[PDB]
């Protein structure tokens, strides 16, 4: 496969940018990271930090995932993020999205060795 760790990179990391760069950002990132491959992914978040910084969260405040497991970690700082949410009138294969800028703590789930982020759970 692609690992469940490079997945997480593809679907949630955008280190090359600081914050969303226009209102068209969700449209482009959902496309180019292939979250619109056969269906429109309804919801998604990207994180505009270095990969390193996001790796670090794994050894930070341990919290309950929103699905009641164990292995979830809130970040100490708040980060620069972008939420992407389908627009009413998105229809595959013209998937369409709303961009939302934010700056909040993120909650990722880590696993395996090395101990890396594997799902994005929530932002706070």
């Amino acid at each position: 496969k692609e690992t469940a760790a490079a997945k997480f990179e593809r679907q949630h990391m955008d280190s090359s940018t600081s914050a969303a760069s226009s209102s068209n950002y969700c449209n482009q990132m959902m496309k180019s990271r292939n979250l619109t491959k056969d269906r429109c992914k309804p919801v998604n978040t990207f994180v505009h930090e270095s990969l390193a910084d996001v790796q670090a969260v794994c050894s930070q405040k341990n919290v309950a995932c929103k699905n009641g497991q164990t292995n979830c970690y809130q970040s100490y700082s708040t980060m620069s993020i972008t939420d992407c949410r389908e627009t009413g009138s998105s229809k595959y294969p013209n998937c369409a999205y709303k961009t939302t800028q934010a700056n909040k703590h993120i909650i990722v789930a880590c696993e395996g060795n090395p101990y890396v982020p594997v799902h994005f759970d929530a932002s706070v």
Binding site: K1, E2, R10, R33, N34
Partner: protein, 175 residues
């Protein structure tokens, strides 16, 4: 002076000769030189084709038996001749990719007695060809096989064949 012990180094015969073929992404694809968006192969005009990887790791190996190929136990043990591995790899000029090479010497129990291994490495993004070479020597007694494995993928997660490019592989024995 000297014979390549690897079947089908350049995909002249598609994937025959290679085993543990892992088709990541849209699998391996044989293409012709210089491929779509990549540099000319400058230094062996007999080489017309490379294998191309896709958007998830593609690998492939050959397990070379030193005896089936003409050597014998006490030769390997007393003379301990040099066993040389070369590989050729590149990337496209319009995407980056990763390469990895792992080559091992096996006893007949198939214990690794010696290894030469790159880890996964970033392929020059100017698209230029890299030769990679190791020579095994004083590896000690009981070498029966040489296992040669390499692989590639892109680092852009594209559809198509934007992964690393491999070709002209060789293993041989020499004085």
């Amino acid at each position: 002076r000297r014979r390549n012990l690897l079947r089908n180094p350049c995909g002249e015969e598609d994937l025959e000769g290679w085993s543990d073929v892992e088709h990541g992404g849209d699998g391996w694809k044989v293409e012709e030189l210089p491929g779509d968006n990549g540099v000319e192969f400058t230094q062996d005009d007999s080489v017309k084709k490379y294998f191309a990887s896709s958007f998830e790791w593609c690998r492939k190996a050959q397990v070379i038996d030193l005896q089936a190929e003409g050597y014998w136990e006490e030769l390997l043990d007393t003379t301990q001749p040099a066993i040389v591995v070369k590989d050729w790899y590149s990337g496209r000029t319009d995407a980056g990719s990763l390469y990895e090479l792992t080559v091992r010497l096996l006893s007949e129990n198939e214990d690794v007695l010696a290894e030469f291994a790159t880890g996964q490495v970033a392929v020059p993004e100017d698209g230029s060809w890299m030769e990679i070479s190791h020579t095994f020597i004083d590896y000690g007694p009981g070498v029966r096989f040489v296992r040669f494995e390499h692989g590639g993928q892109d680092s852009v997660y594209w559809k198509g064949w934007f992964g690393a490019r491999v070709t002209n592989s060789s293993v041989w024995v020499e004085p």
